Design a binder for these strands. Structure first.
Ligand SMILES: Nc1nc2c(ncn2[C@H]2C[C@H](O)[C@@H](COP(=O)(O)OP(=O)(O)OP(=O)(O)O)O2)c(=O)[nH]1
Ligand SMILES: [Mg+2]
Ligand SMILES: [Mg+2]
Length: 539
DNA sequence: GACCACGGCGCC
DNA sequence: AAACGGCGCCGTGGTC
């Protein structure tokens, strides 16, 4: 390419190099652009950012986030990664996409700019005539990238001092638990080493090894195994409590306070747009889609996620979302009727499982019921179901027939889904998002059946993900009109921040946008709450 | 210092 | 551990 002076013309493809992967923390090392047979290299990348009206190229969102961090409105536009990811969602990295579609991903801004240009041309070619994938690109993924850029750059407020206080308390309780474990063992050891624990539990003590680990065949020390031995000794009780406390302290309580950004005073995640096989987003650096909620200590941690002074958090979560989607996709009359009647399957299962009326079903019980319902749906064995529910085999198998006969057209949809997958090599969501599942005619049963469960899950989980992404695209402009912010997506949940004076209006509007995103054969319901912290906002 | 595989486990 | 699916990050253990 002809090396031309910097500024590039309108519509040029950008390339850029960051000191590290996180755009909120990265130094912009170099910036370049490519168009019309020329490459333009910026002499000083930060100043040169001002000359661009859009970020167009590989990893466009990342550059847009860094621009927003510097006070520039540089929205992300076309990204070949999103084209590639819609073609095949195993296209998750620029390294791979470049190799597959006509270049090499290097560490030079110029070459990344020229690569973005030629990869876009080629991938655009591949999507000609793929009208449904094009619709997804234009109406969901491309505009979603601009929304995510804003969410990333806004971040969330964290009660840092609260978590530092909590850390000191949790450390003392961990010491109490490990001290008791070491007494029961008769000696000290690394309780964080599952290899060392294995020896203690199954060799030194006499406890039965219930199961084996996948890759290396060691005797497992997982919670599922240890749950079976819960008063086979008092040491197991202590070990499980130790595991909870150490998991929460080392994953959330200690790391999160150190990730507060100096300019914003807030915690910033990355929403990864080409990371999953089903079309869900992911969150990393720090993952904010797996903040604790379930246990009392987990609830304490979640309370650290708070609103700006003068603002409130608004949390919105779709009701029973994949079951509603399944009703639409299968067209099962009975399941459609269940949601037209305003019934709640999770609560129904909880009430059944624990033998209490609906009014007595607590959050813990509801989460247990979710595992049963989705487990059963996505192909859990009778053998495992009988264990989970803690009842006989049959009762368990009868549960599976009671479930599937109640909704006869689900199985037919499953089988239809699998035959399309075997024939075309991929399955698809309602909107034509594809996942290639190659092993559906594998000659090994365990591998074939695993691929089957993957294949029929995706249209359901992926359609739910499509709905949420579309809702995000529609909602974002309405929020900024009202002076509200989108903070987090958690798969079927959104967390917004609103000025106190507008929070109730924001909640009502966001609820209606989410419910009417793309009407189905059943209604979508959204539970919404408002509060000073993330936990209080879902109560 | 980095990288990785693994078991394990937090959330959806 | 188990014929639920989708993720990312922890500490350990091993390597370069
Ligand atoms: N396969 C599988 N999918 C799950 C599981 N937990 C959650 N999901 C998926 C299916 C849910 O519809 C979706 C959103 O999770 P939620 O925790 O919000 O559950 P859901 O929306 O079903 O119920 P809700 O009314 O919000 O309590 O994520 C699980 O254990 N297995
Ligand atoms: Mg939900
Ligand atoms: Mg949810």
């Amino acid at each position: 390419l002809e090396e031309a002076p910097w500024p590039p013309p309108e519509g040029a493809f950008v390339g850029f190099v960051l000191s590290r992967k996180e755009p909120m923390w990265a130094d912009l090392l170099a910036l370049a652009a490519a168009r019309g047979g020329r490459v333009h290299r910026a002499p000083e990348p930060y100043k040169a950012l001002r000359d661009l009206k859009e970020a167009r190229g590989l990893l466009a969102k990342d550059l847009s986030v860094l621009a927003l961090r510097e006070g520039l409105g540089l929205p992300p536009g076309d990204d070949p990664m999103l084209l590639a990811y819609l073609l095949d969602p195993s296209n998750t990295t620029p390294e791979g996409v470049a190799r597959r579609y006509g270049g090499e991903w290097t560490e030079e801004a110029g070459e990344r700019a020229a690569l973005s240009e030629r990869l876009f041309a080629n991938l655009w070619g591949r999507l000609e005539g793929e009208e449904r994938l094009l619709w997804l690109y234009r109406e969901v993924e491309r505009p979603l990238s601009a929304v995510l850029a804003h969410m990333e750059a806004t971040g969330v407020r964290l009660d840092v001092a609260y978590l530092r206080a909590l850390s000191l308390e949790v450390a003392e309780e961990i010491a109490r638990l490990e001290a008791e474990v070491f007494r029961l063992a008769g000696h000290p050891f690394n309780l964080n080493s599952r290899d060392q624990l294995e020896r203690v539990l199954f060799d030194e003590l006499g406890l039965p090894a219930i199961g084996k680990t996948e890759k290396t065949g060691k005797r497992s020390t997982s919670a599922a195994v240890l749950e079976a031995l819960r008063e086979a000794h008092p040491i197991v009780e202590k070990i499980l409590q130790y595991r909870e406390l150490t998991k929460l302290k080392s994953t959330y309580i200690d790391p999160l306070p150190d990730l507060i950004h100096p300019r914003t005073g807030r915690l910033h995640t990355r929403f990864n747009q080409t990371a999953t096989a089903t079309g869900r987003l992911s969150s990393s650096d720090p993952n904010l889609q797996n903040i604790p909620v379930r246990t009392p200590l987990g609830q304490r941690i979640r309370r650290a996620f708070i609103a700006e002074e003068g603002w409130l958090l608004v949390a919105l979560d779709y009701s029973q979302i994949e079951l509603r989607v399944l009703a639409h996709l299968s067209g099962d009359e009975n399941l459609i009727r269940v949601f037209q009647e305003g019934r709640d399957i999770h609560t129904e299962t909880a009430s059944w499982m624990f033998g209490v009326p609906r009014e007595a079903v607590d959050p813990l019980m509801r989460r247990a019921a979710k595992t049963i319902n989705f487990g059963v749906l996505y192909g859990m064995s009778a053998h495992r179901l009988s264990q989970e529910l803690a009842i006989p085999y049959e009762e368990a198998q009868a549960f599976i027939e009671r479930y599937f006969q109640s909704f006869p057209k689900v199985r037919a949809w499953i089988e239809k889904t699998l035959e399309e997958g075997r024939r075309r090599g991929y399955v698809e969501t309602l909107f034509g998002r594809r996942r290639y599942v190659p092993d559906l005619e594998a000659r090994v049963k365990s591998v074939r059946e695993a691929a089957e469960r993957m294949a029929f899950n995706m249209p359901v989980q992926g359609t739910a993900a499509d709905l949420m992404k579309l809702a995000m695209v529609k909602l974002f402009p309405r929020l900024e009109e009202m002076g509200a912010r989108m903070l987090l997506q958690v798969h079927d949940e959104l967390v917004l921040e609103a000025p106190k004076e507008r929070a109730e209006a924001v909640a009502r509007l966001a609820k209606e946008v989410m419910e009417g995103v793309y009407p189905l054969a059943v209604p979508l319901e959204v539970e919404v709450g408002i509060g000073e912290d993330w936990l209080s906002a879902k109560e």
